[PDB]
């Protein structure tokens, strides 16, 4: 609806096989934090925020327990209708103007993710680069699919080629989204 701002305050997700669940908060389309259901710690996207306000993890866990229960009930009520795998869409782009030799960050936006299970990875000159890499939580979409962001720090260079490997069940073979400082049409 018409709104000047919208806060997503209680967002929970649960998947049965594997007892996979997630809990987050967003404000105006941006992720506020997520709760480590393992460490039981409220982790902030902007760490400066948790310094001025705080969320009690039990609030999330309590919501995980609700959806876990509801999951079981709904599954049976549906006559065990399973989720339908969708095909994600990925797009790679730099946070700022790519300037040869100037430190930057590559961004990989993957959309239409469902179920909320996926593998986002980076390759430089065709080899995995686990390097100042970050990955958002599953950000919610209005059509009940999710989207995700992965980051790769790098210093622009014409002699390297970058790929964002996206693997999903709605995926036949790993999708490789290309990016090069020289405009490298597919490699």
């Amino acid at each position: 609806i018409e709104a000047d701002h919208v806060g997503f305050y209680g967002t929970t997700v649960y998947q049965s096989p594997g007892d996979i669940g997630q809990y987050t908060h967003e404000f105006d389309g941006d992720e506020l934090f997520y709760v480590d259901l393992d460490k039981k710690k409220t982790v902030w996207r902007l760490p400066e925020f948790g310094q001025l306000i705080l969320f009690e993890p039990q609030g999330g866990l309590q919501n995980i327990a609700a959806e876990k229960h509801n999951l079981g009930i709904l599954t049976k009520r549906s006559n065990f209708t399973p989720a339908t795998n969708e095909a994600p869409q990925a797009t790679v782009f730099p946070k700022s103007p790519v300037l040869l030799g100037q430190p930057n960050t590559l961004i990989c936006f993957v959309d239409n993710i469902f179920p909320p299970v996926i593998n986002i990875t980076w390759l430089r000159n065709s080899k995995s680069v686990t390097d100042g890499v970050y990955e958002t939580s599953f950000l919610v979409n209005r059509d009940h699919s999710f989207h995700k962001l992965s980051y790769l720090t790098f210093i622009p260079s014409d002699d390297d080629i970058y790929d964002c490997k996206v693997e999903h069940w709605g995926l036949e073979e790993p999708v490789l989204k290309h990016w090069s400082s020289a405009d490298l049409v597919p490699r």
Binding site: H5, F8, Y23, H25, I53, L54, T81, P97, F109
Partner: protein, 201 residues
């Protein structure tokens, strides 16, 4: 010891599957107008919802009926839910958001580049890249040697970096001339004065 509140998921009665619970609160004109919408999704199908403008639970699909019936039966659930509007939405906005998201200011960085790639048979596109700004509110103008260029301005959609910052590309159509100065004027709430950048040669 507890500032930011989260909306509570109501529990019902009695292959890969998923369920999502969504507590969303929309605000307009401050805290003057606050609406609380909560949804219960099975896989990708929303079945039960609680809408402020409605007053209670309603099934959105046939399988949301059992829950709408029951939760509206239970006065507690109904009251916990109905009140979240103040305890969670009004609260969070007043407290949290106003000292966190509502005060975030990221000053944009503008750069100008010659586009549509080559040299002059149809080569016009001046691309101004305004990146790393917050919030999404912004105004970009183009100036050709003193006056503003209204015709020939093309802005790309607002891109969301995901790190609480935006960026956009505002282009200007052209066929250059020596002695001409094109300026990229950006107006934003983080700035103290609109910022500028200029292209020539």
């Amino acid at each position: 010891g507890h500032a930011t509140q989260g909306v509570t998921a109501a529990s019902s009665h009695e292959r890969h599957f998923v369920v999502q619970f969504k507590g969303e609160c929309y605000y307009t004109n401050g805290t003057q107008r606050i609406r609380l919408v909560t949804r219960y999704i099975y896989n990708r199908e929303e079945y039960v919802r609680y809408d402020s403008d409605v007053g209670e639970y309603r099934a959105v699909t046939e399988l949301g009926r059992p829950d709408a019936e029951y939760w509206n039966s239970q006065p507690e659930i109904l009251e916990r839910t109905r009140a979240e509007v103040d305890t969670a939405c009004r609260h969070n906005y007043e407290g949290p958001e106003t000292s966190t998201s509502l005060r975030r200011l990221e000053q944009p960085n503008v750069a100008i580049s010659l586009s549509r790639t080559e040299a002059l048979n149809h080569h016009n596109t001046l691309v101004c890249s305004v990146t790393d700004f917050y919030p999404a509110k912004i105004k970009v103008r183009w100036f050709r040697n003193g006056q503003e260029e209204t015709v020939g301005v093309s802005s790309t959609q607002l891109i969301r970096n995901g790190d609480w910052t935006f960026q956009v590309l505002v282009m200007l159509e052209m066929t250059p001339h020596q002695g001409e100065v094109y300026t990229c004027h950006v107006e934003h709430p983080s700035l103290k004065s609109p910022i500028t950048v200029e292209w020539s040669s």
